[PDB]
């Protein structure tokens, strides 16, 4: 490893310990997989190290026997996924670390672990999982002890637009200085990927509240040129997150759903049923207060 | 099964209930069939009162569910069932109170065994008309539904005349509920009205 | 026994306060203990400020450790330790008592017949949290709220006395954090469940009222301004001087004028720094209120940006932001165009129902009754030979 023969060294380690898993204690097997995986981050093959991690099972790894080993397993998984920028996945791993007994019980040691999650969870794209996990972080008491982390979770959880040059400046000296996600040289190249979530977030708020809005006004709110604006719209509709239609003489941008007779007949059915139900319910209370008084 | 019950209404704090009778009877019924538990008590009507809540407390004592209060109206009014179900629900609520016990209505319907259904049918010389099976039956029902709707609307219309002219108090919570009825109304002379027209054509 | 103790209380005290010590002793001789309990109450009502209050407790608690009702006894200590200027001493006394109540219940059960005894314990944990908060420990009180809340819910009901103390701790904690929204909910409940005792001084009730008014000026979805002035708590203190301009901020908000509001706020922002730190929320709040109100009293469902801009004194640029916050808060629903520059309302928030609006409801129901009855007459003539 210290010699230039590091390559030949990995190929011997990984081959050996990946066919040897017999009668020996679990604690030792966990250890040899970590060693194998470590070399493979240096190999530049993160895919080799993904396959290895799935050899060791989640059924035999929630015991105090394996406690110090569990933490290192999960720290490595974060490095693998950070290369490939699956941020939602990074966040899941990090969550287990928080829910580990050791970190939770020691007050000081839980402080960095929580903070890292907030960061990555916001860099995720807006999916079904994004919505439920982020509202899990917002509720927690620990989030509320802190105020630096609280401001970031609060921004995305509310259904209010916000402009890029202002989120940037504000949290640049607070959250972007901290290690993991943000901080270092390779990690500063994830600050960038934030700019895209904030403008596409704005578009998510505007579909819901606006139904017609001008192409002219839209350019101003996202703070992007004509050419750029149309691009990130197009990219969102391939993702099937929003419905958008832009007219290229700069007439209308439509967020309003394309309608059919069937959808509409269903909506109106709802309203009628609903009336009949309210008339009866108010009718129970009318009986009580009539005899009573 | 019946209990003896005497009501004195001079003081609604004066009541008769045979305590011992209840415990004795509970145990005998369990030896025929074990699925019988105390799930409540019926009140014979012929209306709801504000007084049924003094009595309800006596039955919470016995039970592991909230007692069902079945107000069985015994002159029998309605083209529906004259049986109301109420279960006492406990929730914090401010309408001049801090913690409210109130009674929430639940639907009354029937379910029957093989034996019991056939025994009903056997009494009846009727072919039913609460069924909504055939064309004939559903016609009868549609007209009963319109008559059901007009009679309830009067009860709502008279209740509101009694606040404003026979002076009961202004109950924000009640009205509040009423308001939304009007808010969620259909409005025609819009494309919504038009989708209906196209619908009629297809059928 | 009680004799030696009684002498010692009188001496260190004033001549005015000798007959108070004397009343207790008399009930004791005769053994009327309903009267002894009441006479302690007169004591802690308005002389919880005398230096002997704590010791006086110490003889009676020992005798009536398991003889009379637990709610009664505990009540004296709590009032005594609201008058201590030293909270390190307050924390120690609670910690011992907390300990005694855990032993006591073994004994006590057989005496009453069968009764609860978690009543004293709940009140003690609240006092530990309140001592912490007057000393500025937000966290120690914070884990005490969680554990205390769950035990309320475990019972079918908590008493009014017990729940006032729980809501007492919550109010204290929130105003330090500076959440207006949180402070608001605790105060409206505190008035509902408020103890009938005169033992809760009016001075606390006044102070609590001032802070309440402040929560609703800075609040985020509070459109209960009219409602606040109905309840005794504000109604009666309108003609006090420092609570004049304070209620004028309520009344300006109601009628939706901007000039009465402007003239008031420029003075009180300077004077009181509370209105200074939450300035951003305060200005926006009027704008939102104007919007809702104009929408509610009318029966039409749309307004142009031009109507809105005059009403709120904002240009049509900020008006689109104004609309977005209102929909988001839950005040209104609708959609926004910028190509016809309409706000299309489809939902209004049910607010206070006035006598006039009941008449209004009713008129429409009469319209619909007739319509149903007419249709049902035709539907009988039709289909006369085909029915079940």
Short mmCIF file of C-alpha atoms in Angstrom, two decimals, chain A residues 81-198:
data_model
loop_
_atom_site.label_atom_id
_atom_site.label_comp_id
_atom_site.label_asym_id
_atom_site.label_seq_id
_atom_site.Cartn_x
_atom_site.Cartn_y
_atom_site.Cartn_z
CA UNK A 81 -23.05 7.93 -3.05
CA UNK A 82 -21.53 11.42 -2.77
CA UNK A 83 -19.41 10.72 -5.85
CA UNK A 84 -22.52 9.88 -7.77
CA UNK A 85 -24.53 12.77 -6.08
CA UNK A 86 -27.53 10.69 -4.85
CA UNK A 87 -28.23 13.16 -2.09
CA UNK A 88 -31.59 11.66 -0.84
CA UNK A 89 -29.70 8.35 -0.44
CA UNK A 90 -26.82 10.05 1.48
CA UNK A 91 -29.39 11.58 3.79
CA UNK A 92 -31.09 8.13 4.55
CA UNK A 93 -27.68 6.63 5.67
CA UNK A 94 -26.90 9.60 7.87
CA UNK A 95 -30.27 9.33 9.52
CA UNK A 96 -29.47 5.80 10.74
CA UNK A 97 -26.30 7.25 12.40
CA UNK A 98 -28.50 9.75 14.29
CA UNK A 99 -30.91 6.90 15.32
CA UNK A 100 -27.89 4.80 16.54
CA UNK A 101 -27.79 4.53 20.35
CA UNK A 102 -24.19 5.79 20.84
CA UNK A 103 -24.61 9.10 18.94
CA UNK A 104 -28.09 9.87 20.36
CA UNK A 105 -26.97 9.43 24.04
CA UNK A 106 -23.83 11.65 23.89
CA UNK A 107 -25.00 15.24 23.58
CA UNK A 108 -21.94 16.79 21.73
CA UNK A 109 -21.48 13.94 19.31
CA UNK A 110 -25.10 14.30 17.87
CA UNK A 111 -24.53 17.96 16.96
CA UNK A 112 -22.66 17.46 13.57
CA UNK A 113 -24.68 14.40 12.58
CA UNK A 114 -28.08 16.22 12.43
CA UNK A 115 -26.67 19.19 10.60
CA UNK A 116 -25.31 17.19 7.72
CA UNK A 117 -28.72 15.59 7.07
CA UNK A 118 -30.58 18.99 6.72
CA UNK A 119 -28.05 19.97 4.04
CA UNK A 120 -28.30 16.93 1.86
CA UNK A 121 -32.03 16.54 2.27
CA UNK A 122 -32.63 20.00 0.75
CA UNK A 123 -30.29 19.24 -2.23
CA UNK A 124 -32.45 16.34 -3.15
CA UNK A 125 -35.00 16.91 -6.00
CA UNK A 126 -38.58 17.34 -5.21
CA UNK A 127 -40.10 13.77 -5.07
CA UNK A 128 -42.77 11.97 -2.87
CA UNK A 129 -39.96 10.94 -0.50
CA UNK A 130 -38.53 14.54 -0.38
CA UNK A 131 -41.99 15.83 0.94
CA UNK A 132 -42.43 13.30 3.83
CA UNK A 133 -38.74 13.31 5.08
CA UNK A 134 -38.32 16.96 5.16
CA UNK A 135 -41.44 17.38 7.38
CA UNK A 136 -40.06 14.71 9.66
CA UNK A 137 -36.88 16.99 10.21
CA UNK A 138 -38.97 20.10 10.67
CA UNK A 139 -41.01 18.65 13.57
CA UNK A 140 -38.08 17.46 15.67
CA UNK A 141 -37.20 19.16 18.99
CA UNK A 142 -33.47 18.98 18.17
CA UNK A 143 -33.97 21.06 15.13
CA UNK A 144 -35.49 23.69 17.43
CA UNK A 145 -32.50 23.71 19.85
CA UNK A 146 -30.54 24.84 16.79
CA UNK A 147 -31.45 28.00 14.77
CA UNK A 148 -28.91 27.84 11.96
CA UNK A 149 -30.47 24.55 10.73
CA UNK A 150 -33.92 25.71 11.54
CA UNK A 151 -33.88 28.54 9.00
CA UNK A 152 -33.01 26.19 6.08
CA UNK A 153 -35.61 23.55 6.86
CA UNK A 154 -38.22 26.34 7.33
CA UNK A 155 -37.46 27.81 3.84
CA UNK A 156 -38.26 24.76 1.78
CA UNK A 157 -41.10 23.44 3.94
CA UNK A 158 -43.11 26.63 3.45
CA UNK A 159 -44.84 27.05 0.10
CA UNK A 160 -43.34 30.46 -0.59
CA UNK A 161 -41.04 31.51 -3.37
CA UNK A 162 -37.59 32.88 -2.82
CA UNK A 163 -34.91 34.44 -4.92
CA UNK A 164 -31.38 32.82 -5.48
CA UNK A 165 -29.00 35.78 -4.70
CA UNK A 166 -30.57 36.11 -1.26
CA UNK A 167 -30.49 32.46 -0.03
CA UNK A 168 -26.86 32.28 -1.20
CA UNK A 169 -25.45 35.39 0.63
CA UNK A 170 -27.56 34.75 3.89
CA UNK A 171 -26.37 31.04 4.56
CA UNK A 172 -22.95 31.32 2.85
CA UNK A 173 -21.09 32.14 6.28
CA UNK A 174 -23.24 29.75 8.43
CA UNK A 175 -24.00 26.44 6.73
CA UNK A 176 -21.61 26.50 3.72
CA UNK A 177 -18.48 26.71 5.95
CA UNK A 178 -19.37 23.40 7.77
CA UNK A 179 -17.82 20.09 6.47
CA UNK A 180 -19.91 17.36 4.79
CA UNK A 181 -22.15 18.46 1.85
CA UNK A 182 -20.66 21.90 1.90
CA UNK A 183 -17.22 23.04 3.16
CA UNK A 184 -14.26 21.48 1.18
CA UNK A 185 -13.07 21.74 -2.35
CA UNK A 186 -15.09 18.88 -3.91
CA UNK A 187 -18.06 19.74 -1.58
CA UNK A 188 -18.19 23.40 -2.99
CA UNK A 189 -19.20 21.77 -6.27
CA UNK A 190 -22.55 20.82 -4.55
CA UNK A 191 -23.19 24.49 -3.54
CA UNK A 192 -23.76 24.87 -7.28
CA UNK A 193 -26.39 22.14 -7.51
CA UNK A 194 -28.38 24.15 -4.90
CA UNK A 195 -28.99 27.00 -7.38
CA UNK A 196 -31.12 24.59 -9.64
CA UNK A 197 -33.27 23.31 -6.66
CA UNK A 198 -34.08 26.95 -5.57
#
